[PDB]
């Protein structure tokens, strides 16, 4: 099969993946089941995973997932919308090619309609930005993340932690700021409300040193990796002493290595000390008698991340015990590891912004992974909102506003691209179409109702209801999505159509 018939079958396969993804749109998205090679199962409506985890034995479907992945971090929530919009564009292009239009012509028509839709998106702008006072507007924007997924209590704390982390990690806020370094961490355990923002790194610690000062105002930190007690490079070490007084000589050597070095280190302004491996608690008793708060069991990647956080690089031997080599913290504080049953000491490094991370807890592995994806999406949307302060009303409102714009613009040209832009219009219409399909209300009735509301009254903030608030205006609903986010979604959809609309593959 070659030519237009091969492209017809290819559009059929693209529709096969697209309508499968269709039901997952929006906050009210219907979930999907994934069973993997490992045999595990998970319920999830987030598009990014159910493309990445999904595999389809067709090359164009592989390009679908690859091109969605390429803008994964760039567009978090859109992972569903871009794919469904590309699918609708291909479904309309099916009819367009059945009418005989050559594929690059409709591709360029889609590009022209993309330009028109982008310029129309420019016309809607909100979200005045000032970093200190933005807290309330930004948590109202993160209300979209809060009210959608399983967070029924809609914790304002997670919205606040995300917005404060993103606003603090870069002091300059005008444009294209370096929000690449931040990341979120989490593990199964306590409630979802068990969260804490750190201007540094949280370490993992064993429950020795029980009542020791886990909180110290250490401006500087001892990053001494030398073994205070016999080391273990995957290889254990041995002990051999002639008598109990020989072991007491070993004790006084240990006392030299503890009091003398740590007196020097405190002279350099550090009390907290790292150890690369722990051996036994009777050696820890000397450290307790020295009132030492210390942590250990840091892995290779763990200790390297500690180094990048504290700016100091590891000290393996005695001769390198100087102030300059050890890493800085400025402050250290201690916070419960779980809810209350276990405790953790956390090292902030506030004097440098190069390390800010978010810790979250969850009552289940499904709960923790859902929190991972939800907080990643919230981080993405807040990042993309503060990168470009302009915003547009979501809930399908922006897509149908662009639908009106490009459909009314379709009469502006004499060339074949007119049907291409009309196809773009009734394909942008799919977002409320499918967003009501996966919701309860009748798709076309509500879609055309809000579409005509945008004509009887000029405000483009009208969209379909997705949380049953009883109102079709999205301004009070505040289901809002970043303007540059919408621009990226539409542009990626147009490119994603183009990259398989001009294909006559083997």
């Amino acid at each position: 099969l070659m030519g237009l018939e091969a492209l017809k079958s290819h559009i059929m396969a693209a529709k096969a993946v697209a309508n499968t993804m269709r039901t997952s749109l929006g906050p009210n998205g219907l979930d999907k089941m994934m069973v993997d090679k490992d045999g595990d199962v998970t319920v999830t409506n987030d598009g990014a995973t159910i493309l990445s985890m999904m595999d389809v034995d067709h090359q164009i479907a592989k390009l679908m997932v690859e091109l969605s992945k390429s803008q994964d971090d760039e567009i978090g929530d859109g992972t569903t919308g871009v794919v469904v919009l590309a699918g609708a564009l291909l479904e309309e292009a099916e009819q367009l090619l059945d009418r005989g239009i050559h594929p690059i012509r409709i591709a360029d028509g889609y590009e022209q309609a993309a330009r028109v839709a982008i310029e129309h998106l420019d016309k809607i702008s909100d979200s005045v930005l000032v970093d200190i006072k933005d807290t309330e507007p930004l948590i109202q924007t993160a209300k979209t993340t809060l009210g959608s997924k399983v967070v029924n209590s809609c914790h304002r704390q997670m919205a606040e932690i995300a917005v404060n982390a993103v606003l603090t990690v870069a002091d300059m806020e005008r444009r294209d700021v370096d929000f690449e370094l931040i990341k979120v961490e989490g593990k199964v355990g306590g409630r979802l409300e068990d969260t804490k923002l750190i201007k540094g790194v949280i370490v993992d610690k064993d429950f020795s040193h029980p009542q020791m000062p886990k909180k110290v105002e250490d401006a500087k930190i001892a990053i001494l990796t030398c073994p205070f007690e016999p080391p273990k490079p995957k290889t254990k070490h041995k002990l051999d002493v002639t008598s109990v007084e020989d072991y007491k000589a070993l004790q006084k050597y240990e006392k030299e290595k503890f009091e003398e070095m740590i007196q020097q280190i405190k002279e350099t302004g550090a009390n907290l000390a790292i150890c690369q491996w722990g051996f036994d608690d009777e050696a820890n008793h000397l450290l307790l008698q020295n009132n030492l708060p210390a942590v250990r069991w840091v892995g290779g990647p763990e200790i390297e991340l500690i180094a990048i956080a504290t700016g100091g690089r590891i000290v393996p031997r005695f001769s390198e015990l100087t102030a300059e080599k050890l890493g800085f913290a400025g402050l250290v504080q201690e916070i419960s590891f779980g809810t209350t049953k276990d405790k953790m000491l956390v090292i902030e490094q506030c004097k440098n912004s190069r390390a800010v991370t978010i810790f979250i807890r969850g009552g289940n592995k499904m709960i923790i992974e859902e929190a991972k994806r939800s907080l990643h999406d919230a981080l993405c949307v807040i990042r993309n909102l503060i990168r470009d302060n302009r915003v547009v009303y979501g809930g399908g409102a922006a897509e149908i506003s662009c639908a009106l714009a490009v459909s009314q613009e379709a009469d502006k040209c004499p060339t074949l691209e007119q049907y291409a832009m009309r196809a773009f219009a009734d394909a942008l219409e799919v977002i409320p179409m499918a967003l009501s399909e996966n919701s309860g209300m009748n798709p076309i009735q509500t879609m055309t109702e809000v579409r005509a509301r945008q004509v009887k009254e000029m405000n483009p903030a009208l969209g379909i209801d997705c949380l049953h608030k009883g109102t079709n205006d999205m301004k009070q609903q505040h289901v809002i999505e970043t303007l540059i986010g919408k621009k990226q979604q539409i542009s990626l959809a147009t490119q994603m159509v183009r990259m398989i609309l001009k294909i006559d593959d083997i």
């Binding site: 007119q418 009309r422 076309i444 009735q445 055309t448 004509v455």
Partner: protein
Amino acid sequence: DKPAQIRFSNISAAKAVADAIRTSLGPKGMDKMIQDGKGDVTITNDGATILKQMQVLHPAARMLVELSKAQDIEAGDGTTSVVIIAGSLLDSCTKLLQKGIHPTIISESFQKALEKGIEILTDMSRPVELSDRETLLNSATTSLNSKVVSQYSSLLSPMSVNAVMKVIDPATATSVDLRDIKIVKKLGGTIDDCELVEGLVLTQKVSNSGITRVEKAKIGLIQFCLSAPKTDMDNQIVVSDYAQMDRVLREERAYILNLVKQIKKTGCNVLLIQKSILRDALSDLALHFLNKMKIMVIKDIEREDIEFICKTIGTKPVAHIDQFTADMLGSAELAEEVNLNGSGKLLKITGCASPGKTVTIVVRGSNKLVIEEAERSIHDALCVIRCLVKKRALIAGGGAPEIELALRLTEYSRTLSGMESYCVRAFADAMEVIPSTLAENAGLNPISTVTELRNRHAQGEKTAGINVRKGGISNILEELVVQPLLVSVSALTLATETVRSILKIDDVVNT
């Protein structure tokens, strides 16, 4: 399940009929060979001559045939545009039911689209006033020059204008009766001799001894017995001689004069001959006696002529002799048999009183096909002028109405709300097949041509259409092709009526 499936099947049959007919559209046209039981050929550029002889099985095909027949009897031309609109609307319906929206909403939305489309077509058209001869001749020449009957429609257009002026004053907007203006043939002849005949042309008479012409003719409407009935056999007894049948023979010879004396007290001049299954008998041996004292017999009258003469000269229908009173008599000005430019025995009635001013046109020609082509030319000329006079304000053709109507109907669907909005949008964006069909039959890229027409109708002239006689999109030439506004009105209204009826139809059932 079943209702959706049966509606899909009905739509498929209607669309198959329409798309088989689609190629043959408009003056350019392209024909098919008809799939018939005899195996002959057709070179008929038009579209009507396929449906009128189409072997139709599915009821959708039959209903589209009724569609075409209704369009033809209403306004004549457009008989293919109507069916192609029907097919395109059914294709849009296929799309809409593929998405699953309900048929009743389809019907209501198409009714709304029809109303707004009629408003739009009435709006943009040129409000030409039809009250005097110059306007009538302008409309006639614009209607005739755009078709292939122009060569001979020229001489007959003023005469058709005269006929329609006889029927009514054009200030009266009521439609003239197409059937009232009858068309007749006098065998053979030239072309120019086709002339208006005020009154009626009548069938040929028998001329034993009857007068050829009579001033102030006293026309009688006779349908009753002629003789003592030869009821069942030529002889009732032994056939050695007609001993007793001589009685009924001389009773014929007596009843002929009895009825002629019953006539002369009224004065019946002519005799329309009904067939021998209604009459007792008809033969020269009595028709001569009727003729010689002024009762001229005219051969083989038919019911349409009887109705026409009743409507014209006021002679009440007759079934018996006793009503020979003046109710069955008419008093014309003159009745003559005229044989100029080739002999012909067709009688003419002139100047008789009439409530309705019925008028007929006699058709002449060196060949029978020429006579019948002149008849169909005058027929469609009367159709177009009547559908203009009853609705005024003719419209430019050539897909321009379809482009302009689709554009404003798409924006109407834009401003419209509810489920019906997308239905009207689909109606508009599928109705544009007619200009696409003209582009296909003109050689241009159909889709690019439709886009160019839609763009030119936007932000500019709304009368621009596809020109069939010069080529391509044109706006500067106003006289691209023009049809009476009723052509498009009837097309849209009948198409939408049948489409919404098809939508209303469910679960076909054999009796």
